[PDB]
Amino acid sequence: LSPQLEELITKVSKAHQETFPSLCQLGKYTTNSSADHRVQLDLGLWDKFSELATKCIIKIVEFAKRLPGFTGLSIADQITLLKAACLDILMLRICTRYTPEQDTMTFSDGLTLNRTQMHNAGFGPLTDLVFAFAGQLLPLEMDDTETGLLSAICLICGDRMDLEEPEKVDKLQEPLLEALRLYARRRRPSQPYMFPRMLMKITDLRGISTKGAERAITLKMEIPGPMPPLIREMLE
Ligand SMILES: CCCCCCCCCCCCO[C@H]1O[C@H](CO)[C@@H](O[C@H]2O[C@H](CO)[C@@H](O)[C@H](O)[C@H]2O)[C@H](O)[C@H]1O
Ligand SMILES: CC1(C)CCC(C)(C)c2cc([C@H](O)C(=O)Nc3ccc(C(=O)O)cc3F)ccc21
């Protein structure tokens, strides 16, 4: 047993929770825009969606800086890691806000969109793949500590190209992986495949993020102006 490891778990858990409200903590509200038929694009929904995406990107940067050692990396390496992982973490985040009964996802201001509205906000032909990923996350029953650590593991990874100090990043990732296995096994000792299944979701996230970046390129053709600047930073 390690006191340092337990403090790391609590610190990452609290950093996730304070930068990403839980479904249960949110006052849900809805919209009647484009709610019943899929269209190419509803620009009112794109505008609201992209605004919320921008806010969540800021929250991910805030979460990252709360991770032990992260601000000890070069500023360039911090930005490199954020740019490489932010879409992955966003995809994880919105898929933890999925309500199977209503077939909806909920954003951090409580906006709750049905599947068609998600499509119409810009997800387009990526919509059903995203909802199926969200679907297959549910059986894991991850809690907010596990989502936070998995997100941290996604972000702090020394494989990203163009890192200055990849070995320093590897060493920062090591206790995160240790903490997630410890925590997961302790919380559900009868389900020992939970930790490896959680790590396998990172590859799935990367696949979904890649499709979302491809979708960003066609969506650009359809909106009257450039995407919001922090979204562009992520997509470069
Ligand atoms: C992946 C793409 C990211 C690559 C790196 C580029 C993004 C770097 C963003 C750092 C932004 C710094 O944030 C700076 O302005 C933000 C908006 O005015 C403020 O953000 C503040 O307001 C937000 C509301 O919009 C809140 O959700 C934040 O919790 C709060 O801290 C910060 O308090 C301030 O420190
Ligand atoms: C429409 C499409 C496919 C192309 C454009 C970009 C790349 C911006 C993108 C980005 C995401 C991403 O998962 C996201 O931003 N999620 C997200 C997560 C949480 C919150 C919140 O808590 O409020 C808001 C969000 F917006 C999903 C779809 C797309």
From Swiss-Prot:
Keywords: Cytoplasm, DNA-binding, Isopeptide bond, Metal-binding, Methylation, Nucleus, Receptor, Transcription, Transcription regulation, Ubl conjugation, Zinc, Zinc-finger
KW NADP (keyword) present: no
Function noted in UniProt: Receptor for retinoic acid. Retinoic acid receptors bind as heterodimers to their target response elements in response to their ligands, all-trans or 9-cis retinoic acid, and regulate gene expression in various biological processes. The RAR/RXR heterodimers bind to the retinoic acid response elements (RARE) composed of tandem 5'-AGGTCA-3' sites known as DR1-DR5. In the absence of ligand, acts mainly as an activator of gene expression due to weak binding to corepressors. Required for limb bud development.
Subunit-level organization: Homodimer. Heterodimer with a RXR molecule. Binds DNA preferentially as a RAR/RXR heterodimer. Forms a complex with PUS1 and the SRA1 RNA in the nucleus.
Subcellular location: Nucleus; Cytoplasm
Record note on domains: Composed of three domains: a modulating N-terminal domain, a DNA-binding domain and a C-terminal ligand-binding domain.
Lineage of the organism: Eukaryota, Metazoa, Chordata, Craniata, Vertebrata
GO cellular component, one term: transcription regulator complex
Source species: Homo sapiens (Human)
Domain of life of the source: Eukaryota
Residues of the NR LBD domain: 4-236
Tissue specificity: Expressed in aortic endothelial cells (at protein level).
Family: Belongs to the nuclear hormone receptor family. NR1 subfamily.
Per UniProt, location of the Glycyl lysine isopeptide (Lys-Gly) (interchain with G-Cter in SUMO2) cross-link in this chain: K220
Range within the parent protein: 182 to 417 of 454
GO biological process: anterior/posterior pattern specification; apoptotic process; canonical Wnt signaling pathway; cell differentiation; cellular response to leukemia inhibitory factor; cellular response to retinoic acid; embryonic camera-type eye development; embryonic eye morphogenesis
Disulfide topology: none
Name of this chain's protein: Retinoic acid receptor gamma
The keyword Nucleotide-binding belongs to this UniProt entry's keyword annotation: no
A GO term for molecular function: zinc ion binding
